[PDB]
């Protein structure tokens, strides 16, 4: 359940699926999210939850550590770059482009279409929440 969620999360970090998260994989994920940690910082972070002192973190070390509304709001405010409370196709094409993913304008427009429940051509907060769920 919630457990399998944590696993899916664990796997986001654990790129090579070798069963452990190295400092390099952490810096990779971190750098992705606009972060820029030194190796030192990465080590102290990995050490903080490395129970067996083996330098790397496995799932049960991870699962032990980890044991939303705001999260989506914060996410919405990242897409909506012009704070007008509506996510345009432009704003969504800006973010997805940033995020790595290369879509066509038709693909973007479709996503807006599907998330636009009240058929007004753009995505508001509740529409964004509803689509994420």
């Amino acid at each position: 359940e919630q457990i399998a969620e944590f696993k899916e999360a664990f796997s986001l970090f654990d790129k090579d699926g070798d069963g452990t998260i190295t400092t390099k994989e952490l810096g990779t994920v971190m750098r992705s999210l606009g972060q820029n940690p030194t190796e030192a910082e990465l080590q102290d972070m990995i050490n903080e939850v490395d129970a067996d002192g083996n330098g790397t973190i496995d799932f049960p070390e991870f699962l032990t550590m980890m044991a939303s509304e705001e999260e989506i709001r914060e996410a919405f405010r990242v897409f909506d770059k012009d704070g007008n409370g509506y996510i345009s196709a432009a704003e969504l094409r800006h973010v997805m482009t940033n995020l790595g993913e290369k879509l066509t304008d038709e693909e973007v427009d479709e996503m807006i279409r599907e998330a636009d429940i009240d058929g007004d051509g753009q995505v508001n907060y509740e529409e964004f929440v509803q689509m994420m769920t």
């Binding site: 999260e71 995020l99 038709e106 996503m111 994420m132």
Partner: protein, 733 residues
């Protein structure tokens, strides 16, 4: 068979809606015997052949049926439905054909601004409309210096006459006559229309209205030509049918002062008007209609005295049919002394009783010249023949005089003819009447086939694509009209006095059964035969065919009439008296085709969407029946065999970029499309590349539409995922 995945929609049969939409639950594995369907209850469909696939919604509601990629009966039905009911659109193209569905509601789409909108535009750049067909014929008249025919077919009341009305309105506007033609309608309906078991006001002939134009393509006047008049109806009616309207209009006006000389009983009192047991039509007041008919003659310049002549001749005909013959056994007959119906006939027709009586009961036989007495049977046949001859000649006389008010002295440089014609007619019980009508349809359909074939050729050549399919109905035509064909064998049998419907049937079998695949015999009957017409098989009952085909007018009876004191009567008559109804039908039909073949034809099919004059009301059973009888379903099956979908390279790009990588997008976009398409669709016989367009076989555009759907559905799950990773990682950091 990879189209039948999960959530895929199909059409399945339904006893009430004809076709029902259904969605696939489980993918179909090649070998499966049942489909897991979902109606909006779940089902287990009994399969080796799969059900019809629904078209993708981007093709639905299109202006031109031939744009549907799954080009089949339920697609056609559904598309016309949604356009008709959701969008209130009564007009839809089917290639070059205009389909018009009767809304039973006056629409504001016929005004001047709309005429001006259609004027000067090209076929297809505007929405389907009767005005566009009119504009085409008008344009091509001037352009090709060729005369045009607008053929408007369908069952009476389904909208033929409304369509003709607006074609003319259009011509009058972009170039009096439209007014006069409209005013003659009650005249033509009264002498040319009748109640049948399926229609209260059915046209039993084809009306060809020549619109004439000068050198400057302005209307100068009109010329009404008539063909295919149904003679048999003058002296015979099946159960629940009437003779032509005007007889009832007269019999319902029997007590009017001016009609007392006519000595009319009620309709149930005349042999020629009672046989069907239906002297009235609900909602119709024949007495009122008589007034309207008299008014129309007045508007068209037919003198009050000539109108009385018309009525004398019709009453004459009525009384003539009541003349009783007495068998002085058995090759001999007489008429009772001072016989009332004969006395009235002779009075109304201005001829001498004894002279008429004698030639009703004798034949002049001319190596020697005898005056033969005739049997009752021969005398009734001759009398009936005479009745039919009087009526037809009267019908012509009336048309000629209508034409006097329509002709112009102006030289005529060109014309556009609007043909008002019935389509295919199939009842539960089909007779000689229906046989002639469906014969006529086989000939019109042939002109249509050949025309479409020609235009296809040009279009292929214009796009530099080789050729193609022609579905020839000459065999059917020949089975009907060639030597030893149906009509010829029927004539043969009629000149044998020992001939019957049954002996005729038998010779049909000996000549054609298992010899012509279009001819069949019902297993349990020797009194019927089955013809595979263009649109459907039709079973005819042989009964009455000999009696209705006979038409031998006795020369001496005509001579009596020609010497009449009633001076209008000889004007009617200013072998051939042994020709036959079927043969005269053949002649009339060939005349019609001569006129039609000497023009560029344009096609309008008018259909009834329901049986109760319900405003915008779409009954699937009625519609399928109407589409089939008007030829649309068969034409579309033919279209669906070739390359019906046709896209510009531009449009192919605009729609299917999303299927393209950037590695194969070029500058020569047309070459991109060729290479892109040769990748998506491996079978190269599924498409052909032309100068400006790609031609696709059926289904192909639909497949591309599923790929496009698939891509966009995956693009959406992908976006949703890469925002789930991004938000999970941000949660945990």
């Amino acid at each position: 068979s990879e189209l039948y995945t999960k959530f895929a929609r199909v059409w399945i049969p339904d006893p009430e809606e004809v076709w029902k939409s259904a969605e696939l639950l489980k993918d179909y594995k090649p070998g499966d015997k049942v489909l897991l369907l979902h109606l909006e209850k779940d089902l287990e469909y009994r399969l080796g052949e799969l059900p019809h696939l629904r078209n993708p919604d981007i093709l639905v509601g299109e202006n031109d049926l031939t744009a549907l990629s799954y080009l089949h009966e339920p697609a056609v039905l559904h598309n016309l439905r949604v356009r008709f009911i959701d969008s209130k659109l009564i007009y839809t193209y089917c290639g070059i054909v205009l389909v018009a569905i009767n809304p039973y509601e006056q629409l504001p789409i016929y005004g001047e601004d709309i005429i001006n909108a259609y004027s000067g535009q090209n076929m297809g750049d505007m929405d389907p409309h009767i005005f566009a067909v009119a504009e085409e014929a008008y344009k091509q008249m001037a352009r090709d210096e060729r005369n045009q025919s607008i053929i408007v077919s369908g069952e009476s009341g389904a909208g033929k006459t409304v369509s003709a009305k607006y074609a003319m309105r259009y011509f009058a506007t972009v170039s009096n006559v439209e007014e006069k033609v409209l005013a003659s309608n009650p005249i033509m309906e009264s002498i040319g229309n009748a109640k049948t078991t399926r229609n209260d006001n059915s046209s039993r002939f084809g009306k060809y209205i020549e619109i004439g134009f000068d050198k400057r393509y302005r209307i100068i006047g009109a010329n009404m030509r008539t063909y295919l008049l149904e003679k048999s109806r003058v002296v015979f009616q099946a159960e629940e049918e009437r003779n032509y309207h005007i007889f009832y209009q007269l019999c319902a006006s029997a007590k009017l002062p001016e009609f007392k000389m006519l000595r009319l009983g009620n309709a149930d009192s005349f042999h020629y008007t009672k046989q069907g047991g239906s002297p009235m039509i609900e909602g119709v007041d024949d007495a009122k209609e008589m007034a309207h008919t008299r008014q129309a003659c007045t508007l068209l310049g037919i003198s009050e005295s000539y109108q009385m002549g018309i009525f004398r001749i019709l009453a004459g005909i009525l009384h003539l049919g009541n003349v009783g013959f007495a068998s002085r056994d058995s090759d001999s007959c007489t008429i009772p002394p001072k016989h009332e119906p004969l006395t009235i006939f002779c009075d109304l027709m201005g001829v001498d009783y004894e002279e008429m009586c004698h030639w009703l009961c004798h034949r002049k036989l001319a190596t020697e010249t005898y005056i033969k007495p005739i049997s009752k049977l021969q005398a009734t046949n001759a009398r009936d023949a005479l009745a039919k001859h009087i009526y037809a000649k009267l019908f012509n006389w009336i048309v000629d005089h209508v034409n006097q008010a329509l002709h112009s002295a102006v030289k005529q440089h060109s014309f556009i003819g609007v043909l008002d014609i019935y389509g295919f007619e199939t009842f539960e019980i089909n007779s000689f009447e229906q046989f002639c009508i469906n014969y006529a349809n086989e000939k019109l359909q042939q002109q249509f086939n050949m025309h479409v074939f020609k235009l296809e050729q040009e279009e292929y050549m214009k796009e530099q694509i080789p050729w193609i399919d022609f579905y020839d109905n000459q065999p059917c035509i020949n089975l009907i009209e060639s030597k030893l064909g149906i009509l010829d064998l029927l004539d043969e049998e009629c000149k044998m006095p020992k001939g019957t419907d049954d002996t005729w049937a038998q010779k049909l079998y000996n000549t054609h059964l298992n010899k012509c695949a279009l001819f069949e015999k019902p297993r349990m009957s020797n009194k019927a035969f089955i013809i595979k017409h263009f649109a459907d098989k039709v079973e005819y009952q042989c009964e009455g065919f000999l009696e209705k085909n006979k038409d031998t007018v006795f020369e001496e009876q005509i001579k009596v009439l020609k010497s009449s004191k009633f001076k209008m009567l000889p004007e009617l008559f200013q072998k051939e008296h042994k020709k036959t109804v079927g043969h005269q039908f053949r002649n009339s039909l060939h005349l019609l085709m001569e006129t039609l073949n000497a023009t560029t034809p344009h096609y309008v099919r008018c259909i009834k969407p329901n049986d109760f004059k319900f405003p915008f009301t779409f009954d699937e059973k009625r519609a399928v029946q109407q589409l089939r009888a008007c030829g649309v379903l068969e034409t579309i099956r033919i279209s669906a065999a070739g390359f019906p979908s046709r896209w510009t390279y531009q449009e192919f790009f605009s729609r299917y970029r999303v299927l393209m990588k950037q590695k194969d997008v070029l500058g020569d976009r047309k070459q991109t499309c060729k290479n892109v398409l040769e990748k998506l669709i491996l079978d190269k016989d599924k498409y052909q590349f032309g100068k400006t367009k790609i031609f696709f076989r059926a289904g192909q555009v639909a497949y591309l539409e599923k790929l496009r759907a698939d891509k966009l559905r995956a693009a959406c799950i992908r976006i949703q995922k890469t925002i789930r990773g991004w938000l999970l990682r941000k949660r945990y950091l």
